Enzyme design. Structure first.
Site, PDB file in Angstrom:
ATOM      1  CB  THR H   1     -18.806 -17.765   3.268  1.00 38.86           C
ATOM      2  OG1 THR H   1     -18.401 -16.578   4.009  1.00 38.86           O
ATOM      3  CG2 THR H   1     -19.657 -18.447   4.416  1.00 38.86           C
ATOM      4  CB  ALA H  49     -21.390  -9.102   4.050  1.00 36.15           C
TER       5      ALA H  49
END
Ligand SMILES: [Mg+2]
Ligand SMILES: [Mg+2]
Lengths: 233, 244, 198, 204, 222, 250, 241, 212, 242
Positions: H1, H49
């Site tokens: 990310t 996540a």
């Protein structure tokens, strides 16, 4: 005498009595009153709730165990929780593992076996609450009475708690009548209320005072309290 | 039930005292007297033996003075068996400290640990305490010569001279009488012996009735020597002092 | 690997340790202190696996601090090390061994002499004039084997460390971002704030 | 990865006429990198000697472990442990970890204070006991040592002579092994005294 | 070696409207190349106006759905008949899922319903718990096919207003249940055209304050 | 269910006595006499075989037990308590010693082990002390010959000679006159026989006396030949005949 | 295995073993702690069952839990050892995980809870100890004095005492300590502490030991002599009349 | 990310992108990667996540408990070490998370800690974390200066994410900005890269490796 | 002696009754529940003037929406509060919402009867009942403001107002009279303050009585000495009339 043999549940008196269990049974007689009565299609529970002050709530006495079973308690509430919780779990297990609604008869058998362990085991203590269990299943309507001694009995109706004997006799006569109240929920309830009123003395059963529960053919175990029992006084 | 036969060995009296501890101390007061005297160049441990006979072999005997490690020893007053249990474990905690830090164990640490094992029986478990009291004689780089004492309550304290067992008050009084800060080993031995001599519940203090021990840091060496006196040597040290 | 050097002069121990923490493709920090003071006269330097490093360090710190208080005394450097070794030697046979290497530089106030111990993640301990962990030693030991003298001053030792650092900045492939030096002597532990340019 | 070859080292012991000798080298390295020139491998508990080759951390651990066991032994039995006995203690302490061994190869040397006879012994990492009248070898250069001893050795040598023998054996065997050397030490053991001599040797 | 997992195909899609939300899923269940069933539902009503589907390895999906319904049962028991809001159901599931983080429930789950304010809501989960509230989401085999479509037709991505030199986005209006169902049907027929695991039937569960309604349409059976 | 007796059954009385222990000592007192005399070149332990009926078979009961091939024990008090102590004592001689040093434990250590067990019965939760006292006699290369007595409290002490049980005092007194430090085993046997005679109420012969010795090494009892370090067990139980031959020389 | 309920309720609502533990507290030497305006002093009287002690080694009554917190007690000496160690550890643990030394309150709440715990766990008797824990919170200069009892209850004090005759000395403090002006100096605080101790210690220099704790890890035990000086000057603020 | 947080005169800036990927599949572009713990504590997420969402929501709980227990707000150091020690307990099990715990307390002032699943916990003034970290650093480091104005800071953090969103395939969606001050965190919007890129190109005159 | 879970011949658990007695000796705690909030006031009860009154914690926050007042052996309440807190926080974690006050309360009472010495029913690891009672008051969206009294017997009741501790019967009686549906937060503060005044031995002031309230808007707030003092003053005047 007594003072020597009542120290625990692992001691039999010279008569063959279990005093701790007996003493347990007494907390029930101290509790408020509740009544159960079944026809061939529904089973109702009417229980008088008991407040502590005019400034408090009326201790909830009925507990839903499954969509098809439930009970009214008389005595030590905690022990009621512990027991209903157990009844909730066994009902859950049958649904999950067998996709079968638990037989009230079996629910009965299970409760007896649970209490009994606390009536033959050291340091343990009998449960101090009696239970009226109702339910509809593959074989119609049912009402079961549970006592801390471990004794469970299925009856057309009955009552427990202080002054219970009033209603218990009332129903004993009213039998031939109520057992035929098929397809008419409100009536059985009424019959229940009448019966419950037979063990009164204090004041008349009111809104904050009454608690009724019904289960049956096309009726899931539903709890009616206060605002909704108005029509049944 | 079972509670029926439980004595509750770790409870408080209405007076905030521990029965079993108080009662154990009492047991100990009937035990042979043990004494520890700390000098400026040593420590003497002397003990009077209980249970004797013409036939008892004193040569190969050690019922009151035990070696904990090369720099520390203890004198016992109480049940000899309860003693051995605590000793065997104290010896071990010594060796553990060594392995872990590669330094000999500080006398007080060893002592405090032992006292902690005793305090346990005082607060939990439901077992009788050990009917034993110890006088530890030890040396260490941080405090040198040390003398401590521990009893059933798990409490410990340090001393210049001390005694445990029978006749403590008598012996203590005699020690408070003739002891002086700047004593010497050969003198403390004498004192130790004298004290025993006047508290003994027997006729005369004989060699076979004694156990003597000294922890000297000899000048021509460096290593703290521990010498547990042999029968012949007790007899000797006894004649020197004149008890004969 | 990161750099961990230590050199014992006549009256002190100087530990030099790299200021970089790199993870993957980036240098995350250029001012790390790969060191923990075990006690006022004992400093430990560490390097190895990402987390195990600080975790093992702080754990050893806690344990040594506790002992300090329980006895109101400071364990000898030699003691602190033997302790550390055993923690390591026990770790090597656990489920997940601490993969940490340490240098312990302490001033023994009783013997009035500085000491330096090198211990690897397997609990391999040894006392030395100078030591290092990782690849640094591959250069510095020979450099030191040549330029080191037992009677050097704290200042001479620092200069010697300087040589070491230079050789390392010249020949090692990773930019370790310099070092943080700390001297352990009779008066305690102090960090040479002037090494990035002395 | 082979635990027994990370640090390097050798130990050897021989018996003589009313004497025994045990020697070793002083190297401690990490594969190619020599790290320490002062790592002794011979230890003693009273009059009994134990040399330990193999993984350093274990050598250290075992030493500490046998100091303990021997220390307690003396406190309980009230005499110092004998070789014949210490051997058994070593063997069993080793077999105790049969399925996750200490990677070491101990050697025991001493003279029974009671009988006066010279005694020495070696063990595999799990306790096999090899009691020999002649020599026991151990370490990274075990093959070399076996070669030296097997040839150089002859029964009943005097302390002074045995010292030569054991020394040349060690010295030469060390020089043909990359992981050993960096100094050597020899212990000549006699009932009365024991002399420890350091040797001059190739420092490469 | 025993492989504890399998893939039973199927695809599910959920769309949240202003005062409704739907959770549609195909009805085929397969194994490798064989069709196990042409009609085995995987989108269920869990009570409290909450529909859920856990698509992937049916055994796991089933186990998950079972454990959740039950969690709803006990929420009522332990918290005096309180209705489990969708946001709460979601978080509950996160925990159900993450409890198996080291032996995951190999499934991609979604639940739909109305939020506390009555507006439509859809929530979707990663096999180990990551979750978020969304306007729409498809899951399962043909997810990759259907998702882009929805971004376009439901969220109007890449669509701008004619004659604005592409400087003004298309007004983000909200579809009606009727339109949503049209989209659901197209997304499914399309997916059936191109994916060999998708087909046989489509069952949609519509959720409004008036409860839960079921609609069923046939799909190609090849 | 379960042993909930987790507290000590032997505690301290206000006079500092450990009741259960004193009581066990009484039980010992009620037990038959057993003695042990230590010689310069041996040790003998003996006792009487209180045949509890003439129908019972005397031989099928060893009151004298070999612990190791150089150690024996005899007792006075509650036999069962003894029998189990022998089992344990025999086991511990292996687990805490032969399985670690490859040689049998020395008398004092073995004794030390036995004693520790007895102590535990004095403090562990849920038990009663052992109602016995034992005389353990042995020899070991480094301590020579020894003789020990172990009481229910767990205390042990070495003796030149002693006796325990019923006629203890009288016997202790008889030994004190006869004993001296230049006794050759045969003479101690003799003395033991005499001492034993005075406690023995009725029949006295090898069928009622169980006397054992710890003396010289006996290779004919080893069972094998070929190893010159294991010279043979030093403990020998005397036969009925061997006892009589010495009885007929009263 | 051993799980007998020792602390239990009796017909009147008392937990005897807890109450009897308070007695063992009353039977222990006095300990006082009074806090100044920039300090806290903790004094303790000395036991007298036997004398010929080695003053050098014997574990004094005031212990450092950490470099900035001390704890003195009245009661079973042995019992106190356990609380101290347990307190010290938590002192370290807290440092390790919060990266900040404990506040006196935290440390107090910790020790307190351990005591409470022993009053309702099977197989154990309450701690026969009461404690005074004082020091300063990290980076703060406001002195802290707290007291704990075997019940487990705790709270803070401007000045307080525990142990034998604490009832008498408490009174002295109650009268001589004004909350409007706590002993504004290390000296007057020590004095007031000694004065109080004197009222019951009964003139005995070697019978008193005092400790002063200042901010930022400055904890110092007075010399047998410096106290003797306090005893001296104090006997004059009684004699000049 | 792609996430960053950096310290300066006016506080701390925390900017993160909002893309969630399943390999090369773009799973979502509407993920909040910043979890608001308490009015003075932010935790950024990068890695798995679930791992992040889960353990950081949890962190939030443990922070609250501390409040209840000590009455004082949890420090950033302590808040961070909780996550860190937690993660270290699971070391070797496969947790995947790289995160920054940014916050302001009267005691520490503005503070940022980087904590990753390997157990590395570090204090610093500038950290960029994630697959796009290098891209962010590139832009960040070159224009970063301590005396930056709050407005310029916002923009810079913003821009850096923009940067990474452009070059790093695995980053994108939109930038979420946060300003942490003496008085708490202040959210400064959600900016869609879809529109932000174009605006920035025209106004700033950069990204000339693109035409439009 | 006999076990700790023995039933008297009257059908009651001894240890429970006994603890209930110990509870009768505690500082008074009063809570009144109105449509504008719930007040919980308590009597500090310093056992000496040197004790720093503000260091008396008898009213604690369980969560922003739940507060609690204790009465009895207050050390026994520590583990209860902890469990109460953890129970509420944990609930927020697993369901992203506030725990219902009944639910929180019910969770606390589940601890109550978990005392014994091997009572074959589960694993009861506590040697004796809690020697304290709690007044739990809070607010949730489903059932509004609520006050609960939790006893060591495992039972708990909901009250419009309740007093626990030494002056219970008296105070309870007074409450009974003064209470009514349309009360106001301030009126309630007063009554608590008034009724406290009555049953309190020492003269009620800001350093010995503590008030607190919980409202939907601001949550559980423990009134600061200055705010309470103003109310105390506002009371002397309301009472100093008729
Ligand atoms: Mg070379
Ligand atoms: Mg097909």
């Amino acid at each position: 005498f007594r003072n020597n043999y009542d120290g625990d549940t692992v001691t039999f008196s010279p008569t063959g009595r279990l005093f701790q269990v007996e003493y347990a049974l007494e907390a029930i007689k101290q509790g408020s009153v509740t009544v159960g009565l079944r026809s061939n299609t529904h089973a109702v529970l009417v229980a008088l709730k008991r407040n502590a002050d005019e400034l408090s709530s009326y201790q909830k006495k009925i507990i839903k165990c499954d969509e098809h079973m439930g009970l009214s308690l008389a005595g030590l509430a905690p022990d009621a929780r512990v027991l209903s919780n157990y009844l909730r779990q066994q009902c859950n297990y049958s649904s999950l593992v067998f996709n079968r609604k638990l037989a009230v008869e079996r629910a009965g058998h299970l409760l007896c076996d649970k209490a009994q362990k606390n009536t033959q085991s050291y340091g343990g203590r009998p449960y101090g609450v009696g239970l009226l269990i109702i339910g509809y299943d593959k074989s119609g309507a049912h009402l079961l009475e549970f006592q801390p001694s471990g004794n469970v009995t299925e009856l057309y109706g009955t009552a427990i708690g202080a002054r219970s004997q009033g209603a218990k006799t009332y129903l004993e006569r009213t039998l031939d009548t109520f057992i035929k109240i098929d397809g008419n929920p409100d009536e059985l309830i009424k019959a229940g209320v009448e019966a419950i009123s037979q063990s009164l003395r204090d004041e008349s059963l009111t809104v904050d005072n009454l608690s009724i529960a019904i289960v049956g053919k096309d009726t899931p175990f539903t709890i009616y309290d206060g605002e909704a029992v108005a029509k049944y006084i | 039930g079972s509670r029926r036969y439980d004595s509750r060995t770790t409870i408080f009296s209405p007076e905030g005292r521990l029965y079993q501890v108080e009662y154990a101390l009492e047991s100990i007061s009937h035990a042979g007297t043990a004494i520890g005297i700390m000098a400026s160049d040593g420590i003497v441990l002397a003990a009077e033996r209980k249970v004797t006979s013409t036939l008892l072999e004193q040569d190969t005997s050690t019922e009151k003075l035990y070696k904990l490690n090369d720099k520390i020893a203890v004198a016992v007053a109480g049940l000899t068996a309860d003693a051995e249990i605590l000793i065997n474990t104290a010896r071990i905690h010594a060796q553990n400290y060594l392995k872990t830090y590669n330094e000999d164990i500080p006398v007080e640490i060893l002592v405090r640990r032992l006292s902690d094992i005793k305090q346990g029986y005082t607060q939990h478990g439901g077992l009788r305490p050990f009917g034993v009291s110890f006088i530890y004689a030890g040396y260490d780089d941080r405090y040198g010569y040390q003398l401590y004492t521990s009893n059933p309550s798990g409490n410990y304290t340090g001393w210049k001279a001390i005694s445990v067992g029978a006749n403590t008050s008598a012996a203590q009084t005699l020690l408070q009488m003739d002891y002086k800060d700047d004593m010497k080993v050969d003198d403390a031995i004498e004192l130790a012996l004298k004290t025993l001599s006047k508290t003994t519940d027997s006729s005369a203090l004989t060699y076979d009735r004694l156990e003597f021990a000294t922890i000297r840091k000899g000048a021509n060496d460096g290593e703290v020597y521990q010498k547990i006196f042999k029968p012949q040597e007790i007899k000797d040290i006894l004649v020197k002092t004149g008890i004969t | 690997m990161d750099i961990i050097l230590g050199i014992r002069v006549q009256d002190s121990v100087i530990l030099a340790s790299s200021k970089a923490v790199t993870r993957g493709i980036s240098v995350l920090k250029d001012s790390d202190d790969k060191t923990r003071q075990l006690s006022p006269h004992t400093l430990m330097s560490f390097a190895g696996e990402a987390g195990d490093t600080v975790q093992f360090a702080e754990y050893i710190q806690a344990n040594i601090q506790l002992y300090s208080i329980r006895e109101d005394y400071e364990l000898s450097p030699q003691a602190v090390s033997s302790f550390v070794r055993q923690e390591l030697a026990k770790s090597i046979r656990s489920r997940r061994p601490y993969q940490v290497n340490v240098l312990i530089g302490g001033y023994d106030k009783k013997k009035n002499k500085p000491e330096l111990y090198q211990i690897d993640y397997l609990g391999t301990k040894v006392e030395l004039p100078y030591g290092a962990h990782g690849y640094s030693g591959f250069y510095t030991f020979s450099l030191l084997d040549h330029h080191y003298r037992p009677d050097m001053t704290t200042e001479e030792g620092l200069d010697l460390l300087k040589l070491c650092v230079q050789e390392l900045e010249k020949r090692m492939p990773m930019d370790f971002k310099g070092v943080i030096v700390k001297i352990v002597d009779k008066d305690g532990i102090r960090q040479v704030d002037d090494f990035q340019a002395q | 990865s082979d635990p027994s070859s990370i640090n390097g080292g050798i130990v050897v012991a021989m018996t003589g006429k009313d004497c025994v000798a045990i020697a070793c080298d002083l190297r401690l390295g990490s594969q190619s990198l020599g790290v320490s020139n002062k790592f002794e491998k011979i230890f003693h508990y009273g009059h009994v000697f134990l040399g330990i080759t193999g993984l350093a951390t274990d050598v250290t651990t075992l030493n500490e472990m046998f100091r303990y066991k021997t220390n307690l032994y003396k406190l309980k039995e009230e005499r110092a442990i004998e070789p014949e006995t210490f051997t058994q203690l070593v063997s069993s302490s080793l077999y105790e970890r049969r399925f996750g061994p200490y990677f070491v190869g101990p050697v025991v040397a001493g003279i029974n204070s009671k009988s006066g006879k010279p005694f020495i012994a070696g063990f595999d990492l799990i306790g096999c006991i090899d009691e020999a009248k002649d020599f026991i070898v151990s370490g990274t250069a075990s093959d070399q040592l076996f070669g030296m001893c097997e040839s150089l050795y002859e029964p009943n040598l005097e302390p002074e002579d045995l010292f030569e023998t054991i020394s040349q054996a060690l010295l030469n065997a060390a020089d043909r092994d990359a992981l050993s050397g960096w100094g050597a030490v020899v212990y000549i053991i006699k009932k009365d005294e024991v002399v420890k001599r350091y040797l001059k040797m190739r420092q490469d | 070696q025993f492989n504890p997992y399998g893939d039973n195909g199927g695809t599910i899609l959920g769309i949240a409207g202003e005062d409704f939300a739907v959770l549609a899923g195909d009805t085929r269940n397969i194994t490798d190349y064989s069709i196990n069933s042409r009609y085995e539902p995987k989108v269920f009503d869990c009570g409290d106006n909450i529909v859920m589907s856990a698509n992937g390895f049916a055994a796991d999906g089933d186990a998950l759905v079972k454990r959740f319904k039950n969690s709803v049962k006990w929420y009522h028991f332990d918290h005096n008949d309180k209705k489990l809001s969708i946001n709460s159901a979601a978080r509950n599931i996160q925990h159900l899922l993450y409890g198996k983080r080291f032996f995951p429930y190999y499934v991609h789950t979604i639940i739909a319903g109305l939020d506390e304010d009555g507006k439509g809501a859809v929530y979707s989960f990663d096999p180990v718990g990551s979750y978020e509230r969304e306007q729409c989401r498809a899951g399962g085999a043909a997810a990759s096919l259907i998702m882009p479509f929805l971004d376009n037709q439901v969220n109007f991505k890449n669509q701008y207003e004619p004659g604005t030199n592409g400087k003004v986005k298309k007004p983000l209006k909200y579809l009606s249940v009727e339109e949503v169902i049209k989209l659901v049907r197209d997304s499914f027929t399309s997916a059936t055209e191109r994916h060999i695991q998708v087909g046989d039937g489509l069952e949609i569960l519509i959720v409004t304050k008036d409860g839960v309604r079921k609609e069923f349409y046939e799909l190609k059976r090849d | 269910m379960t042993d909930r007796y987790s507290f000590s059954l032997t505690t301290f009385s206000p006079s500092g006595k450990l009741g259960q222990i004193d009581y066990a000592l009484t039980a010992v007192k009620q037990g038959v006499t057993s003695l042990g005399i230590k010689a310069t070149n041996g040790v003998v332990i003996a006792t009487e075989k209180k045949s509890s009926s003439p129908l019972a078979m005397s031989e099928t009961l060893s009151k004298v037990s070999l612990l190791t091939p150089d150690i024996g024990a005899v007792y006075s008090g509650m036999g069962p308590d003894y029998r189990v102590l022998v089992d344990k004592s025999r086991k511990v001689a292996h687990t805490s010693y032969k399985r670690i040093y490859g040689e049998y434990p020395p008398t004092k250590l073995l004794v030390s082990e036995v004693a520790k067990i007895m102590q535990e019965a004095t403090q562990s939760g849920g038990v009663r002390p052992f109602g016995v006292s034992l005389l353990i006699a042995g020899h070991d290369e480094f301590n020579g010959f020894s003789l020990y007595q172990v009481d229910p409290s767990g205390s042990y002490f070495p003796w030149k000679a002693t006796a325990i049980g019923k006629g203890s005092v009288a016997a202790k007194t008889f030994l004190e006159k006869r004993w001296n430090d230049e006794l050759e085993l045969e003479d101690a046997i003799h003395i033991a026989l005499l001492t034993l005679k005075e406690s023995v109420e009725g029949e006295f012969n090898g069928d009622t006396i169980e006397l054992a010795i710890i003396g010289d090494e006996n290779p004919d009892l080893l069972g094998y030949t070929g190893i010159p370090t294991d010279k043979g067990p030093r403990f020998r139980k005397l036969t009925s005949q061997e006892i009589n031959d010495r009885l007929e020389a009263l | 295995g051993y799980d007998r309920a020792l602390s239990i309720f009796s017909p009147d609502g008392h937990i005897f073993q807890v109450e009897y533990a308070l007695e063992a507290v009353k039977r222990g030497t006095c300990a006082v702690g009074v806090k100044g305006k920039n300090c806290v002093v903790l004094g303790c009287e000395r036991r007298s069952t036997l004398k010929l002690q080695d003053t050098r080694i014997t574990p004094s009554k005031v212990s450092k839990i950490d470099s900035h917190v001390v704890l003195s007690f009245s009661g079973l000496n042995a019992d106190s050892r356990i609380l101290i160690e347990k307190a010290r550890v938590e002192a370290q643990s807290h440092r390790l995980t919060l990266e900040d030394p404990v506040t006196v309150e935290y440390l107090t709440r910790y020790v307190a809870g351990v005591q409470q715990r022993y009053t309702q766990s099977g197989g154990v008797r309450p701690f026969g100890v009461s404690t005074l824990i004082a020091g300063f919170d990290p980076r703060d200069d406001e002195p802290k004095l707290y007291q704990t009892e075997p019940s487990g209850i705790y709270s803070s004090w401007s000045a307080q005492t525990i142990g034998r005759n604490s009832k008498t000395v408490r009174e002295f403090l109650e009268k001589n300590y004004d909350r409007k002006e706590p002993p504004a100096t290390v000296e007057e605080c020590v004095k007031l502490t000694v004065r109080s101790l004197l009222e019951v210690v009964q003139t005995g220099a070697k019978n008193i030991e005092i400790t002063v704790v200042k901010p930022d890890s400055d904890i110092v035990a007075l010399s047998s002599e410096e106290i003797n000086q306090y005893v001296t000057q104090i006997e004059q603020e009684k004699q000049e009349q | 990310t792609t996430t960053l947080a950096f310290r300066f005169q006016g506080g701390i800036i925390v900017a993160v992108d909002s893309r969630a990927t399943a390999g090369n599949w773009v799973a979502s572009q509407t993920v909040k990667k910043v979890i608001e713990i308490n009015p003075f504590l932010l935790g950024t997420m990068a890695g798995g996540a679930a791992d992040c969402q889960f353990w950081e929501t949890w962190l939030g709980s443990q922070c609250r408990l501390h409040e209840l227990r000590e009455k004082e707000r949890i420090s950033v150091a302590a808040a961070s070490k909780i996550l860190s020690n937690l993660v270290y307990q699971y070391k070797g099990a496969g947790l995947s998370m790289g995160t920054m715990i940014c916050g302001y307390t009267r005691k520490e002032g503005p503070t940022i800690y980087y904590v990753d699943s390997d157990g590395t916990r570090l204090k610093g003034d500038i950290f960029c974390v994630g697959s796009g970290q290098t891209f962010a650093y590139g832009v960040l480091d070159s224009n970063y200066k301590w005396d930056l104005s709050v407005e310029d800071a916002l923009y810079l953090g913003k821009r850096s994410i923009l940067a990474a969103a452009h070059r790093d395939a695995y980053s994108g969606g939109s930038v979420n900005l946060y300003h942490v001050t003496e008085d708490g965190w202040i959210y400064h919007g959600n900016h869609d890269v879809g529109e932000l890129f174009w605006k920035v190109k025209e106004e700033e005159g950069s990204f000339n490796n693109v035409i439009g | 002696d006999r076990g700790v879970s023995t039933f008297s011949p009257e059908g009651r658990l001894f240890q429970v009754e006994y603890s209930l007695e110990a509870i009768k000796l505690g500082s008074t705690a009063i809570g009144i529940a109105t449509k504008e909030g719930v007040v919980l006031g308590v009597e500090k009860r310093a056992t000496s003037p040197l004790l720093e009154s503000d260091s008396i914690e008898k009213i604690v926050e369980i969560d922003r929406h739940i507060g609690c007042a204790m009465s009895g052996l207050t050390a026994d309440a520590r583990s209860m509060i902890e469990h109460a807190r953890t129970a509420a926080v944990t609930h927020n974690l697993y369901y992203d919402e506030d725990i219902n006050v009944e639910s929180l309360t019910q969770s606390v009472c589940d601890l109550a009867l978990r005392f014994g010495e091997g009572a074959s029913g589960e694993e009861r690891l506590m040697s004796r009942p809690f020697g304290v009672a709690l007044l739990i008051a809070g607010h949730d969206a489903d059932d509004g403001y609520q006050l609960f009294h939790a006893e060591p017997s495992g039972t708990f009741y909901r009250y419009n107002a309740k007093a626990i501790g030494s002056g219970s019967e008296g105070a309870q009686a007074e409450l009974l009279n003064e209470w009514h549906s349309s009360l106001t937060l301030k009126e309630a503060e007063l009554l608590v303050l008034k009724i406290l005044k009555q049953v309190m031995e020492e003269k009620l002031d800001e350093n010995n009585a503590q008030l607190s309230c919980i409202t939907k808007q601001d949550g559980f707030k423990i009134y600061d000495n200055e705010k309470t003092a103003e109310l105390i003053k506002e009371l002397k005047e309301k009472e100093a009339a008729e």
